[PDB]
């Protein structure tokens, strides 16, 4: 029937493909072999006698992590030809990841794109994950999206971007790779989701109460975001939400396709022992600016619209009561050209708790996707950062000699300034 | 003799329409396996209004169900009383409408209408003389308001003289789901005012109001709201399947509810309706059936009828009940709040009796009412829709698929002239 095909580019993409597909196997009930002890057809294939293989791709230019996947536990879950590996990385260079060391693996990746997408008709679209601050995450993720654009045009390309944080970068050439990824990302993306790492750093510190976790504990929460967003495709619900539902209701103009998400309740076993998780309590906690997972404060940003969607044993009466009280509260405010700004979906099957993971067994959960005009600051803070970098020729001697010319930098500056003017006129 | 062919579009109209067949199958003694039980002549002398004999003793529905998604089609089939429908009458869709009126009406809505127009006409001509078509859908999303009303247009140009009922769930005014609300609302109605004989206006949060206080349900699910609508559906067609002292068919309603072909918008509410404790206390009688109905709180539309004036209406009573106080209570209300009725009409709302009560009941009444007080409902959709067009919201899913802004201003003009047409009758 229907299917969605994931893309996992970058090292962040590989280990988010290890996390997201661990939760997908641990929800539908498939062992690491690939067997069981029709709702699973959305992500898994029907291979052989009762074996199910993921409908994803793993793209990376460095084998030190992706071979490390096919050496560990899930080495007989994925296809052997599935995990495509390069010989050397880009090393935080958009120039190599898009032009020189990148071109010899995109033909092999799109080889497995069409070989895995020609299985059954009903394909909703693609679901790509990348590291913007990384080199091969934005590098291969650039030209993979033009090639999907010229092959499968109308297909819904939904794209999770792990955007780099303002004062958390773990890199120095972040403003150079992030601008060149932005120049590739506006004209080729249907749906975009913002993931600033320092906000998931903080919503695990104050909400999960765990004070020193690692990158993989971030990947628990992002996997819970997708396992919310896409389970309405799989199981019965009061109001089913499709992949094609998102881009038909969250993008007002094709350039404002940058949406920002949140989740509730990010609650451990010892705070789920004490708070009732009512629909009113779980909705206003999702809109609390500390719980926002991209560090973009919406008090001074005007909400365009929003799409709440729920899981568990949620009654639609409490959905309409909770959605009304967040309308009537004054601290939130809307653009006056979009008075009706909320869309609700309901799924019945509660989120499964992963063992070892910090989350608790939650009886009902909320995922949220909002578009606003607060995205002006998340780029404007990067504009002063990059203009100050580019003033006196910082790190540009790599970028010139590795395939591209000076002038692509200025044209990537002009269209981010174009979306600066575009976001303010929406918010007038 | 007389036959009614059901059309259900959207998953809203399929859920609130499957319950219609669940109460009709309950009324006529049909099992979910299609076997009659209940050994009464008067439950079975009129089956053909909704069922056809299927050479196995199974009375199968005359219902065509259409959707652009199959996730709600198999949930109806797998539910109770869901195997009653013939599998060929299911109309599957593979692509799906993402709550856009343009795609449900032009691109793949027309790609499905060539396979749903043939199945509605196999059912239609098989009877000797069809009475009317009824449609049950919603204007919130895309596949109900874009393709259900396109089937409405195609059956009008094929069978013009036939009556054209529809039961539309308008989007809820103050609690807004389906975030592209006024596009799927206004772009359907101006194409619906020229292709519908009767339209019955029902709102979701009006059903939420009556479950909250008058019925006192602590957890009102969607299946609860579907049965408030469904109990109101059986009262409109009681005389079609049952005899009565004074009968009334659907076209008896159409002649006494609309004086002009331009307005055919009505207001539906059902009585009696009390809570579990209050049912054991309440007196079911002909006086205490009617002032519940002449009440804004009972109404299944979120437009207050006290704000305007009743032009015409109707009441269809049901049960073993007398006919004097049908009209003495009908005109005592016409004499006490006489400012609430228009002064240029005789005895403004009509009377009907159907001898068979709803199952379990001994007394009930339904009501179809054309009132000018639905203007605040249309105007609240109006100023939200114009707020969309001050700065051209969400246009690219409507422009690149085969229409333009000339039809947007056509939607504004063909809706505002009904606003002014309603404004000049008070």
């Amino acid at each position: 029937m229907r299917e969605v095909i994931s893309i996992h580019v970058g090292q962040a993409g590989i280990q988010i493909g290890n996390a997201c597909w661990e939760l997908f196997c641990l929800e539908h009930g498939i062992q690491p072999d690939g067997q069981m002890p029709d709702a699973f057809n959305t992500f898994f294939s029907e291979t052989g006698a009762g074996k199910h293989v993921p409908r994803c791709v793993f793209l990376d230019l460095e084998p030190t992590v992706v071979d490390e996947v096919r050496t560990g536990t899930y080495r007989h879950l994925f296809h052997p030809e599935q995990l495509i590996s390069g010989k050397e990385d880009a090393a935080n260079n958009f120039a190599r990841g898009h032009y020189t060391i990148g071109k010899e693996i995109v033909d092999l990746s799109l080889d497995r794109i069409r070989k895995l997408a020609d299985n059954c008709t009903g394909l909703q679209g693609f679901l790509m994950f990348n590291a913007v601050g990384g080199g091969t995450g934005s590098g291969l993720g650039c030209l993979l999206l033009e090639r999907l654009s010229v092959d499968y045009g109308k297909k819904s390309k939904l794209n999770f971007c792990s955007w780099p944080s303002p004062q958390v970068s773990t890199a120095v050439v972040e403003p150079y790779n992030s601008v060149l990824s932005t120049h590739s990302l506006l004209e080729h993306t249907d749906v975009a989701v913002m993931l600033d790492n320092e906000a998931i750093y903080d919503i695990c510190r104050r909400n999960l109460d765990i004070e020193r976790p690692t990158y993989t504990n971030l990947n628990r929460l992002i996997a819970q975001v997708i396992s919310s967003l896409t389970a309405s495709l799989r199981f019965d619900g009061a109001l089913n939400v499709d992949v094609t539902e998102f881009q038909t209701n969250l993008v007002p103009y094709p350039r404002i396709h940058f949406m920002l998400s949140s989740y509730a309740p990010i609650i451990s076993a010892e705070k789920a022992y004490h708070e009732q998780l009512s629909v009113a309590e779980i909705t206003n906690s999702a809109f609390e600016p500390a719980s926002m997972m991209a560090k973009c404060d919406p008090r001074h940003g005007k909400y365009m619209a929003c799409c709440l969607m729920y899981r568990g044993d949620v009654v639609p009466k409490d959905v309409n009561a909770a959605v009304a009280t967040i309308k009537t509260k004054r601290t939130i405010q809307f653009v006056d050209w979009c008075p009706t700004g909320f869309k609700c979906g309901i799924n019945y099957q509660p989120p499964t708790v992963v063992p070892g993971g910090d989350l608790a067994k939650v009886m009902r959960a909320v995922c949220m996707i909002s578009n606003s005009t607060a995205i002006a600051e998340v780029f404007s803070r990067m504009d002063h950062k990059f203009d100050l970098m580019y003033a006196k020729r910082a790190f540009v001697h790599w970028y010139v000699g590795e395939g591209m010319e000076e002038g692509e930098f200025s044209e990537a500056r002009e269209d981010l300034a174009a979306l600066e003017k575009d976001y303010e006129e929406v918010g007038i | 003799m007389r036959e009614i062919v059901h059309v259900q579009g959207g998953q809203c109209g399929n859920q609130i329409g499957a319950k219609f067949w669940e109460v009709i199958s309950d009324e006529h003694g049909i099992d979910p396996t299609g076997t009659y039980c209940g050994d009464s002549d008067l439950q079975l002398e009129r089956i053909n209004v909704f069922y056809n004999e299927a050479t196995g003793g199974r009375f199968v529905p005359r219902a065509i169900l259409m959707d652009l998604e199959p996730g709600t089609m198999d949930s109806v089939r797998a539910g109770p009383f869901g195997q009653l429908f013939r599998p060929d009458n299911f109309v599957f869709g593979q692509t799906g409408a993402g709550n856009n009126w343009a795609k449900g009406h032009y691109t793949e809505g027309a790609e499905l209408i060539d396979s749903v127009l043939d199945v509605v006409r196999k059912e239609a001509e098989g009877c000797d003389c069809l009475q009317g078509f009824q449609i049950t859908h919603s204007l919130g999303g895309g596949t109900g308001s874009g393709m259900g009303t396109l089937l409405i247009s195609k059956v009008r140009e094929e069978y013009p003289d036939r009556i054209m009922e529809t039961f539309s769930v308008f989007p809820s005014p103050k609690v807004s789901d389906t975030v592209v609300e006024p596009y799927n609302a206004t772009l359907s109605v101006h194409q619906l005012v020229e292709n519908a004989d009767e339209v019955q206006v029902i709102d979701n949060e009006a059903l939420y109001d009556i479950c909250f206080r008058t019925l006192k349900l602590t957890t009102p699910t969607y299946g609860d709201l579907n049965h408030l609508v469904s109990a109101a559906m059986s009262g409109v067609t009681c005389c079609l399947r049952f005899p009565g002292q004074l009968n009334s068919d659907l076209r008896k309603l159409a002649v006494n509810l609309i004086p002009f072909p331009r307005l055919h918008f009505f207001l539906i509410g059902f009585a009696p309706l009390t809570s579990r404790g209050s049912q054991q206390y309440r007196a079911l009688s002909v006086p205490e059936l009617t002032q519940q109905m002449f009440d804004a709180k009972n109404m299944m539309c979120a437009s207050d009828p006290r704000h305007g004036r009743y032009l015409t209406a109707s009441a269809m009573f049901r049960g073993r009940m007398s006919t004097k106080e049908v009209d003495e209570q009908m005109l005592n209300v016409q004499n006490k709040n006489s400012s609430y009725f228009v002064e240029w009409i005789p005895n403004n709302m009509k009377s009907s009796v159907c001898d068979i009560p709803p199952k379990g009941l001994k007394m009930s009444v339904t009501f179809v009412g054309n009132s000018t007080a639905i203007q605040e409902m249309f105007k609240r959709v109006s100023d939200q829709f114009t707020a969309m067009f001050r700065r051209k919201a969400f246009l690219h899913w409507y422009t690149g698929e085969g229409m333009d802004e000339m039809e947007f201003t056509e939607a504004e003009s063909n809706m505002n002239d009904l606003v002014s047409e309603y404004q000049q009758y008070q």
Partner: peptide, 18 residues
Amino acid sequence: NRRNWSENIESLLRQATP
């Protein structure tokens, strides 16, 4: 299936007492 349930309202519109 779970989209639709008339089990409280079904008894609310029958005049029966437990």
